[PDB]
Amino acid sequence: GPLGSPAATTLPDGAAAESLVESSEVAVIGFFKDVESDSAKQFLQAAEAIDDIPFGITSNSDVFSKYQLDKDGVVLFKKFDEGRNNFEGEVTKENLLDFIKHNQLPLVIEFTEQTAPKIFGGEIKTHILLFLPKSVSDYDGKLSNFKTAAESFKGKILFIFIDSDHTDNQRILEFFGLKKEECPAVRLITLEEEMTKYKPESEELTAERITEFCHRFLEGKIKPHLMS
């Protein structure tokens, strides 16, 4: 019965490393000298618990040199964005699963049929939504600005963008109770103790608008919900 293989892929060389990657858009590798330690085992049980993103491991000296390292440590590989995210230090199955799932996705994500489910999850997090009309033409510019702002608040909030989709996004508009007056705007969403949405108001500048919203929130401001 040709079937059944470890969720974690260990490559004693770079060549084997790239192989596992090509077999998966995004993958995370961990450097462990003595996998015999209870830590290493915990990391394994975790990688298996979640098959969302394949995990790999390495302990060869040749590998560390390639990445300019001389000590253990795990790092996540991604197509875009950072590409590599070295874990702080604490090796935990639960804490690792979160970092992986939270790092498995880009700093920003466009609203789409696939994004709908990807959002429902996250597990209590703060993310802002930006409504963009066409999006085309300003992709490079907007992206460059988004990344900058995202990196500044990386690990605290994720900036998402929504495509006007005046056609397929019809249902979405209904939920927000918006019609004809369906013009560009910025909306922020929070997650922790409840599911509350934030609607825009004043008109400033692209980044200044989004960055201004976050600041207000972290400034210990009041809850949005509606207008008083």
Side-chain angles (χ1 to χ4, degrees), residues 11-194:
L11 332 317
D13 46 69
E18 66 186 78
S19 205
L20 88 88
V21 185
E22 216 83 17
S23 195
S24 187
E25 305 86 33
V26 190
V28 58
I29 316 294
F31 297 51
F32 259 95
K33 304 162 140 201
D34 220 60
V35 185
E36 262 189 89
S37 258
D38 255 352
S39 285
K41 297 297 167 265
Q42 291 301 49
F43 200 62
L44 237 292
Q45 242 262 14
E48 216 103 35
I50 71 174
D51 254 24
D52 190 7
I53 179 164
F55 314 73
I57 306 82
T58 166
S59 73
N60 267 239
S61 260
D62 268 342
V63 184
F64 296 84
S65 282
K66 277 141 191 140
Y67 197 39
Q68 241 295 315
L69 298 185
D70 265 76
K71 316 225 233 72
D72 63 67
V74 183
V75 193
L76 195 147
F77 280 58
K78 240 145 85 241
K79 186 86 102 306
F80 46 39
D81 192 21
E82 306 126 41
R84 299 113 126 241
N85 233 145
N86 209 136
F87 215 126
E88 298 280 309
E90 203 152 15
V91 292
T92 321
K93 63 182 227 254
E94 200 124 294
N95 292 274
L96 81 83
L97 248 53
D98 292 67
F99 193 53
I100 306 295
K101 264 213 71 227
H102 283 26
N103 183 220
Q104 223 282 145
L105 305 162
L107 248 166
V108 300
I109 48 283
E110 196 216 80
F111 224 91
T112 346
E113 262 189 288
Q114 248 175 64
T115 336
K118 283 222 196 230
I119 309 294
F120 290 19
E123 216 153 352
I124 58 172
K125 45 139 172 231
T126 308
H127 51 187
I128 58 90
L129 188 148
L130 197 91
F131 166 79
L132 309 116
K134 223 242 255 310
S135 237
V136 189
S137 227
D138 194 19
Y139 48 107
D140 261 310
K142 77 158 216 302
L143 225 58
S144 265
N145 229 241
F146 264 94
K147 222 273 298 299
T148 9
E151 270 280 54
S152 267
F153 287 69
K154 58 153 281 221
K156 200 55 126 148
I157 183 176
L158 49 127
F159 314 148
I160 58 160
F161 32 112
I162 67 175
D163 231 1
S164 232
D165 278 9
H166 68 333
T167 57
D168 224 73
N169 261 23
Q170 62 170 335
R171 242 108 198 194
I172 310 181
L173 308 143
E174 193 153 344
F175 156 95
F176 210 63
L178 208 77
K179 315 297 274 301
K180 237 137 156 195
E181 291 88 284
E182 49 136 345
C183 296
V186 187
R187 172 184 163 230
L188 318 315
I189 313 111
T190 16
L191 229 178
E192 248 167 327
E193 316 206 313
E194 254 196 356

